[PDB]
C-alpha cells in the first residue's frame, strides 16, 4: 500500500531509492514513461519554476536592471519583447538545452550507464548532493511549481500587487 494513498498499491518502479519518493503515483505513469526521464522533466520544471517565482517576485517588488522597462511582471514579457532584448535570454537557453539536455536525454533513453535525470554534476561550490539536499531540492521545486501556477493565474485574474488577492493581506489574514 502506498504511503500517500492508503487505498492503493504503490507501483514497483517507485521503490524508495529516489529522492522525494512518497508513493504518490495513482495513475501509474512510471510504467509507460521511464522514471529517469520523468525525474529529469520534474527537476527541469521545478528549477524553472523556482527561478520564475523568485524573478516574478523581485520584478514585482521593483528590482529592475537599468535600461529595462519599469513594468510589473505581468506586462514584463510584452515590454521586453517590444523593447528587443529578450532573444538574448533565449540564446543561452538555446545552447544549454541543445548541448546538455538533448545528449543527456538520449543518454537516459538509450545508455544504461548514464547519470540520473536532472544530474548535471553541477557542484561548483561543492555544497553536496546528499539525500537531504536532494529531498529539499525536490520539495522546494514542487512547492515552486504550485506557487508559480497560483501566482500567474491569480495575477492575470486580479491585476493587483504582490499578494495577488483581491483584498490583499486581508484574504490571507481574514482577522484584518
Amino acid at each position: 500500500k502506498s504511503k500517500s494513498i492508503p487505498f492503493l498499491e504503490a507501483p514497483p518502479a517507485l521503490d524508495g531509492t529516489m529522492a522525494g519518493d512518497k508513493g504518490f503515483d495513482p495513475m501509474r505513469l512510471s510504467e509507460v514513461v521511464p522514471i529517469q526521464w520523468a525525474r529529469e522533466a520534474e527537476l527541469k520544471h521545478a528549477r524553472i519554476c523556482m527561478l520564475a517565482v523568485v524573478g516574478w517576485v523581485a520584478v514585482d517588488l521593483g528590482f529592475t536592471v537599468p535600461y529595462a522597462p519599469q513594468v510589473s511582471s505581468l506586462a514584463a514579457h510584452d515590454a521586453a519583447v517590444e523593447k528587443g532584448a529578450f532573444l538574448f535570454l533565449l540564446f543561452p537557453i538555446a545552447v544549454v538545452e541543445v548541448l546538455a539536455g538533448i545528449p543527456k536525454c538520449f543518454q537516459i533513453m538509450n545508455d544504461p550507464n548514464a547519470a540520473p535525470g536532472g544530474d548535471y554534476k553541477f557542484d561548483p561550490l561543492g555544497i553536496g548532493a546528499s539525500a537531504d539536499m536532494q529531498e529539499k531540492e525536490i520539495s522546494n521545486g514542487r512547492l515552486a511549481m504550485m506557487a508559480f501556477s497560483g501566482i500567474v493565474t491569480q495575477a492575470a485574474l486580479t491585476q493587483a500587487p504582490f499578494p495577488y488577492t483581491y483584498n490583499g493581506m486581508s484574504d490571507l489574514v481574514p482577522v484584518l
Partner: protein, 70 residues
C-alpha cells in the same frame, strides 16, 4: 472551458465513452471489473477513453451550439 452546460456535457460524454468502450473485448459495460481493466490496460484505458470522449464531446457541443439548444 467556459459554460457549466459545456462542462456537464463534456463530463457526461467522457464518462459514457469510458463506460461503454471496449478494448480487446474487455469493458465496463461488458461486465469487466474496474480493477481488472486498470491492471490489464493501465492509464491507456483513461487516455484513449478521454480522447474519444473529447472528440464526441466536441461533436455534440458544436452540434448543440449550431442548433441553439445550448
Amino acid at each position: 472551458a467556459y459554460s457549466i452546460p459545456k462542462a456537464f456535457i463534456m463530463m457526461f460524454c467522457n464518462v459514457l465513452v469510458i463506460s461503454t468502450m471496449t478494448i480487446q473485448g474487455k469493458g465496463l459495460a461488458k461486465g469487466t471489473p474496474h480493477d481488472e481493466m486498470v491492471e490489464s490496460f493501465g492509464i491507456t484505458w483513461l487516455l484513449a477513453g478521454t480522447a474519444l470522449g473529447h472528440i464526441v464531446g466536441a461533436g455534440t457541443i458544436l452540434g448543440c451550439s449550431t442548433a441553439g439548444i445550448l
